[PDB]
Design a protein around this motif. Structure first.
Motif, PDB file in Angstrom:
ATOM      1  N   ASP A  10      17.705  -2.261   6.780  1.00 59.40           N
ATOM      2  CA  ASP A  10      17.212  -1.019   6.133  1.00 59.40           C
ATOM      3  C   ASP A  10      15.711  -1.175   5.878  1.00 59.40           C
ATOM      4  O   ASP A  10      15.355  -1.950   4.969  1.00 59.40           O
ATOM      5  N   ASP A  11      14.886  -0.471   6.667  1.00 58.83           N
ATOM      6  CA  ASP A  11      13.396  -0.443   6.602  1.00 58.83           C
ATOM      7  C   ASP A  11      12.810  -1.744   7.178  1.00 58.83           C
ATOM      8  O   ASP A  11      11.638  -2.047   6.872  1.00 58.83           O
ATOM      9  N   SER A  50      17.027   7.067   6.150  1.00 60.44           N
ATOM     10  CA  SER A  50      18.328   6.345   6.139  1.00 60.44           C
ATOM     11  C   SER A  50      19.511   7.253   6.499  1.00 60.44           C
ATOM     12  O   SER A  50      20.284   6.881   7.400  1.00 60.44           O
ATOM     13  N   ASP A 303      17.709   0.669  10.456  1.00 61.92           N
ATOM     14  CA  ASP A 303      18.036   2.123  10.414  1.00 61.92           C
ATOM     15  C   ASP A 303      16.767   2.942  10.680  1.00 61.92           C
ATOM     16  O   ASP A 303      16.908   4.096  11.142  1.00 61.92           O
ATOM     17  N   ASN A 304      15.583   2.389  10.393  1.00 63.49           N
ATOM     18  CA  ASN A 304      14.286   3.085  10.613  1.00 63.49           C
ATOM     19  C   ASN A 304      13.143   2.078  10.505  1.00 63.49           C
ATOM     20  O   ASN A 304      13.396   0.936  10.105  1.00 63.49           O
ATOM     21  N   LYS A 331       8.154   4.502   8.783  1.00 68.27           N
ATOM     22  CA  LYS A 331       9.200   5.224   8.006  1.00 68.27           C
ATOM     23  C   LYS A 331       8.701   6.624   7.621  1.00 68.27           C
ATOM     24  O   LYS A 331       7.548   6.732   7.186  1.00 68.27           O
TER      25      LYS A 331
HETATM   26 CA    CA Z   1      15.961   3.048   5.755  1.00 69.89          CA
END
Ligand code: CA
Length: 475
Positions: A10-11, A50, A303-304, A331
């Motif tokens: 995540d990130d 997300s 996710d990004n 992001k």
């Molecule tokens: Ca994320």
């Protein structure tokens, strides 16, 4: 037909792992995984944030067709942004839900005969909605239902399936926990209050490992949706001191860009990623010890793209790798830095180790890839299976005509097309801009040289493809 472990961070940026050029952050177990499988160099998310990313991943529909296209907190319900209020009132927790009966990869794998589990973070439906993990193809869930809760790694509770499990952690608002008045911002002691009794990533892991031990003699589809390394910057002191000794001293982070203060923001961002790397290390050890490594395929991705806030320093780590990571480029934006994510797949004795494919694929494709891998008729999808690429038979790898993205956030608004080397973006859509930026990714990977005026023919093709690609109300 094998086990599947889909690890989603995540990130985590393109260049935040050693095998995509990361110089500072140690990712031994992640690099070892890369060396034992295929590295994908043109793998895209569904979205640069997300919830739509995870919506695209789960539903097998692209961001122009998907149920969820932005982070939607449903603030009409009441005081959703108050953590005291959310602790008392679960009706205020979490995000816009998936519809009941939504065909997700979890549900596909379920009616394929797989025991399914998700561990870490959900973000696709509030507690008691029709969109909770257990109602969306997951026999088993543990961790954060809510993207707002995961902003602290010492939350007052998590979920075990549909039920809350209260933890020995005081209820906090990580956006409203500044340093005590007249505390020395240079004294680590002043930050001690941001470490409580039970670190969420420890619990999430113990439960994921329990699920493996529980289902070792069974076909299982396990998604590890860790919230790491999303801010706030909280990690075990062991792993922080490792990187304080390595990087040396640094300016403290005092919450300027939101989330918790952090004495050693660089050392802590590293510690977070290395901590999780070491968890992957123990998972692999367990797969081997239980003779599952040979029968278990493993995806690892993010996710990004990397972030700009919470004491993160994406430029200092070059978290975007090939791409810029300052606000605007990572992001929340459809620049490569934000939508292209590092991807590794291992299936020992089936995938060839130390290999690389530049096949253009995205989260949409994960559904049909699993449907082909499980020998099952694929539900409707915007995806194209990339299993042929995984197994070395490029000869039978279908290609996308183009990829579409939209992030219709309330402030900015973004649409983008990739078609070969050609990458078009329309941003500032909310401010009423319709002007496309066109980049040649072959001569201009960092998208720093707009050439839309030089290809009016390509801009027009792209304008029409953006209309055809998308569903629902325009913006
Ligand atoms: Ca994320």
């Amino acid at each position: 037909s094998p086990n599947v472990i889909y690890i989603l961070m995540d990130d985590l940026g393109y260049g935040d792992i050693g095998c995509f050029g990361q110089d500072k952050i140690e990712t031994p177990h992640i690099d070892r995984l890369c060396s034992e499988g295929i590295k994908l160099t043109q793998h895209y998310s569904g979205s640069p944030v997300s919830a739509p990313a995870r919506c695209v991943l789960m539903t097998g529909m692209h961001s122009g067709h998907a149920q969820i296209r932005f982070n939607n907190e449903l603030a009409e319900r009441g005081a959703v942004n108050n953590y005291d209020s959310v602790y008392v009132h679960k009706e205020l927790e979490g995000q816009f839900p998936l519809q009941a009966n939504t065909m997700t990869i979890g549900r596909m794998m379920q009616q394929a005969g797989y025991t399914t589990g998700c561990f870490g973070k959900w973000g696709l439906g509030y507690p008691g909605s029709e969109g909770t993990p257990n109602k969306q193809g997951f026999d088993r869930f543990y961790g954060y239902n809510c993207q707002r809760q995961s902003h602290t790694y010492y939350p007052p509770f998590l979920y075990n399936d549909e039920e809350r499990v209260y933890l020995s952690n005081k209820v906090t608002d990580p956006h409203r926990s500044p340093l005590d008045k007249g505390a020395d911002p240079n004294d680590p002691a002043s930050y001690a209050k941001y470490t409580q009794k039970e670190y969420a990533n420890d619990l999430i892991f113990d439960e994921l490992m329990g699920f493996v031990d529980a289902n070792k003699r069974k076909p299982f589809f396990l998604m590890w949706t860790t919230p790491l390394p999303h801010v706030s910057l909280q990690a075990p002191e062991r792993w922080v001191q490792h990187y304080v000794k390595k990087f040396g001293d640094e300016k403290p982070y005092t919450g300027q860009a939101g989330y918790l203060p952090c004495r050693y923001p660089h050392a802590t961002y590293a510690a977070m990623i290395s901590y999780f790397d070491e968890q992957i290390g123990q998972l692999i050890e367990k797969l081997k010890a239980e003779h599952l490594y040979e029968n278990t395929l493993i995806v690892f991705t993010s996710d990004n793209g990397p972030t700009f806030n919470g004491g993160s320093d994406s430029p200092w780590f070059n978290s975007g790798g090939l791409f810029n990571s300052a606000y605007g480029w990572g992001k929340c934006f459809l620049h490569e830095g934000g939508i292209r994510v590092p991807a590794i797949i291992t299936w020992p004795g089936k995938i060839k180790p130390g290999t690389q494919s530049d096949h253009i694929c995205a989260f949409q494709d994960v559904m049909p890839t699993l449907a082909e891998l499980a020998g099952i008729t694929c539900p409707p999808t915007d995806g194209i299976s990339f299993l042929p690429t995984l197994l070395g038979k490029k000869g039978k790898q279908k290609e996308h005509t183009y990829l579409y993205w939209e992030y219709p956030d309330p402030r900015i608004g973004n649409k983008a097309i990739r078609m070969g080397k050609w990458k078009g973006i329309i941003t500032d859509i909310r401010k009423g801009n319709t002007q496309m930026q066109l980049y040649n990714l072959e001569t201009d990977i960092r998208e720093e040289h707009d050439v839309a005026a030089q290809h009016p023919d390509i801009v027009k093709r792209f304008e029409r493809l953006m209309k055809e690609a998308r569903n629902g109300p325009d913006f």
